Amino acid sequence: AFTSVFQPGKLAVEAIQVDENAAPTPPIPVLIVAPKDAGTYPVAMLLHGFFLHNHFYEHLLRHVASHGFIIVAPQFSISIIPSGDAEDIAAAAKVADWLPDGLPSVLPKGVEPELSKLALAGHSRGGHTAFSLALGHAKTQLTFSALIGLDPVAGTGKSSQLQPKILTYEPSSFGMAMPVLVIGTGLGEEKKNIFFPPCAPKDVNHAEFYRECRPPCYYLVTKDYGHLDMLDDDAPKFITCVCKDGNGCKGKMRRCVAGIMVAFLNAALGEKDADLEAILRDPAVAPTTLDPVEHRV
């Protein structure tokens, strides 16, 4: 038995997208996945990676909420003009400051957002943008309480990182209060097709992020999977083939990532601090091979 987090969440889920055509109109289009079943629920924000559509993350969202969670992932613009990620950083802040008056309005009947409990997470660049906002470089009316890093990336290399190079290369240097989790794709470093460079350059690799983390800080790595394997299966192949692609059921790791997340959030936004632990004690429960996996408190 152990943890059913990896397993599908019993609560049913509903897919909601605001097209800026529903008052209060949002700062930008965001996809909202919330349990249709009534009851106050915690809320979380996911940041789409560059050249990626929130829709490509449907499976992860559905499962996460299915286990009891309200997830809102904005579809940032191509951000062509904005240098670095500043634009994305602010956009999320706007969404965050938009949730209070907009989430309740769009939320399905019976669903109330305990915004008091809010967490931020990002994939690749999206992860950079998030940690940035978490590092408080920008400003948000609400207050976060957890940070999940979906194999985050920082830039081409140390000499060249997105705005700003939050990385300091000093262990435990992140002055953040929200406990943080960093899931890693082992093959992220491994390159593929040659012409295409590593999607997860080292130095900017999730690894340096987890290192600069300050206890509390949790770390798990999907050894046999790729930077974009978690993306939904329907993922436009001409948009995913770039990164290395594990030789295994993308659905599996997708479920594994979902479980890792719910446990972390449950142990943060929520109150249960046992599922994540059991995982930490016996990662074998995971569908995939989580290695390495270490904890700092």
Contact (CB, 8 A) for 17 and 30: yes
Query: What one-character DSSP code corresponds to residue 258?
Result: H
Does 128 participate in catalysis according to the annotation? no
Does 227 participate in catalysis according to the annotation? yes
Q: Is 114 in the site for its own copies (CB under 8 A)?
A: no
Does 88 participate in catalysis according to the annotation? no
SS3 letters across 90-157: HHHHHHHHHHHHHHHHHCCCCEEEEEEEEEEEEEEHHHHHHHHHHCCCCCCCCCCCCEEEEEECCEEE
Contact (CB, 8 A) for 159 and 118: no
Q: What does 8 bind: Ca ion, its own copies, none (CB cut-off 5 to 8 Å by kind)?
A: its own copies
Residue in 227, 229, 232, 275 annotated catalytic? 227
Interface residue list for Ca ion (CB under 5 A): 58, 234
Here's the x/- map for its own copies, 224-263, by CB under 8 A: it reads as --------xxx-xxx----------xxxx-x---------
For residue 116, the tally of other CB atoms under 10 A from its CB is 12
Site for its own copies, residues 47 to 106, rule: CB under 8 A: 58-59, 62, 66
Give the three-state DSSP class for 259: helix
Q: Is 36 in the site for its own copies (CB under 8 A)?
A: yes
Distance of closest approach, residue 60 Cβ to its own copies, in angstroms: 9
Closest CA to 201 of 237, 154, 235: 154
Which member of 4, 14, 163, 289 binds its own copies (CB under 8 A)? 14
Contact (CB, 8 A) for 107 and 155: no
Q: What does 36 bind: its own copies, Ca ion, none (CB cut-off 5 to 8 Å by kind)?
A: its own copies
Quick one: tokens of 233? 């299966």
Q: Taking the mean position of all CA atoms in its chain, how far away is CA 129?
A: 11
Here's the x/- map for its own copies, 162-201, by CB under 8 A: it reads as ----------------------------------------
Residue in 85, 151, 229, 275 annotated catalytic? 151
Q: What is the binding site for its own copies (CB under 8 A)? A: 8, 12-15, 36, 58-59, 62, 66, 232-234, 236-238, 249-252, 254
